[PDB]
Amino acid sequence: EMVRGQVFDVGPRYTNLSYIGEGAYGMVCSAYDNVNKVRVAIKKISPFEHQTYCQRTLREIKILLRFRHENIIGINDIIRAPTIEQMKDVYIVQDLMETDLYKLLKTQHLSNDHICYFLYQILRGLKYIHSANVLHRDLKPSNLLLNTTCDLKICDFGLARVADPDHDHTGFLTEYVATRWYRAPEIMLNSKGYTKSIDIWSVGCILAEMLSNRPIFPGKHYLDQLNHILGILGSPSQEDLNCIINKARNYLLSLPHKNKVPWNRLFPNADSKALDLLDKMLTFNPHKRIEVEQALAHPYLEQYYDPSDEPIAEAPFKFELDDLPKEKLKELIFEETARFQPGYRS
Numbered sequence: 639e640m641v642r643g644q645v646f647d648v649g650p651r652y653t654n655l656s657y658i659g660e661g662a663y664g665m666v667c668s669a670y671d672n673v674n675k676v677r678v679a680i681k682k683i684s685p686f687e688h689q690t691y692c693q694r695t696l697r698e699i700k701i702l703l704r705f706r707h708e709n710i711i712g713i714n715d716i717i718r719a720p721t722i723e724q725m726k727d728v729y730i731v732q733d734l735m736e737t738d739l740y741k742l743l744k745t746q747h748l749s750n751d752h753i754c755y756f757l758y759q760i761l762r763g764l765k766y767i768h769s770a771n772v773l774h775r776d777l778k779p780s781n782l783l784l785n786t787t788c789d790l791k792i793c794d795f796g797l798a799r800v801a802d803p804d805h806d807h808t809g810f811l812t813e814y815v816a817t818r819w820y821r822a823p824e825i826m827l828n829s830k831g832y833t834k835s836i837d838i839w840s841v842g843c844i845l846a847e848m849l850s851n852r853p854i855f856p857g858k859h860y861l862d863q864l865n866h867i868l869g870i871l872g873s874p875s876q877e878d879l880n881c882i883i884n885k886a887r888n889y890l891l892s893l894p895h896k897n898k899v900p901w902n903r904l905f906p907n908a909d910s911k912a913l914d915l916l917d918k919m920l921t922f923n924p925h926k927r928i929e930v931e932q933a934l935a936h937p938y939l940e941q942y943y944d945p946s947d948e949p950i951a952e953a954p955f956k957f958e959l960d961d962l963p964k965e966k967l968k969e970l971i972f973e974e975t976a977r978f979q980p981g982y983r984s
């Protein structure tokens with residue numbers, strides 16, 4: 639029943655459990671599915687003591703239950719108690735993946751070819767996300783699940799949002815956007831975490847990481863993060879500085895003049911086509927940044943690009959939840975996971 643410490647209680651359908659990983663409010667195991675006669679992954683999530691944790695759980699369930707794409711992880715089943723009072727944990731059943739891009743980059747240097755097809759799969763998945771008017775907001779190697787060189791799946795839609803390009807600059811300390819190393823400069827400079835451009839920047843960082851087996855911008859904190867970006871891209875132009883909305887223009891104007899390090903000096907063994915696409919993805923100005931359809935049509939991905947085999951969402955996605963108390967989110971999580979319960983009507 640239990641996996642060395644915490645109880646699982648996923649049976650009688652899910653047996654022969656083995657521990658995978660853990661976090662602040664969750665634990666992941668592999669389990670044998672006695673129905674589909676295959677091994678699956680089960681995410682035990684206990685978020686109900688904290689509002690933000692509830693937001694992330696609900697966010698990922700609503701989005702993954704609506705999405706159906708080869709490069710996006712799905713939700714196969716959800717195990718949860720029959721009453722709200724009894725519900726303390728939520729078990730999310732997903733397809734079992736061998737590993738993730740983070741683990742792979744620790745043991746292997748990827749060939750140009752593999753990188754290429756990994757990049758294509760990420761962008762193929764992203765095209766579906768963006769066509770649904772959705773932003774992942776946390777794209778990074780550990781959120782890129784793998785089985786083979788031909789089987790990649792984007793996971794963890796906890797930070798996902800519907801794209802609202804014309805919305806309030808919220809506040810710097812109000813929301814957690816990307817993982818720092820993959821965080822777009824617009825998020826750090828003028829709190830803009832509701833445009834498609836932020837995801838293309840993350841992908842750019844992932845591409846640079848596949849090319850050298852190390853993160854391109856490993857900042858200690860967000861100012862160090864901007865210093866790292868500036869160290870390669872160079873000191874921003876007057877036009878690029880006009881996009882900075884905040885005090886924010888100050889510390890950048892305080893820094894010495896940094897020249898643009900050429901991509902080929904940073905990555906001498908990389909294909910010039912990959913470095914040309916990397917350049918378009920890692921543009922400091924979000925308005926000048928390459929869009930997902932343009933990245934796919936780039937010459938670097940010409941051997942895989944096929945718009946007739948790249949599915950898009952049937953309709954844009956719609957849900958706000960961030961201002962709701964943890965008790966209402968628990969109620970919404972109960973409603974969303976009701977499909978997987980016995981006796982479910984309508």
Ligand SMILES: O=c1cc(-c2ccnc(NC3CCOCC3)n2)ccn1[C@H](CO)c1ccc(Cl)c(F)c1
Binds near residue numbers: 793
């Ligand atoms: O949502 C998911 C789904 C999976 C998942 C799904 C299917 N298969 C495999 N296989 C793994 C085999 C070993 O290598 C990594 C992939 N993983 C893995 C992680 N996550 C997120 C990432 O933020 C996560 C991480 C820790 C905790 Cl605690 C958690 F709740 C959620």
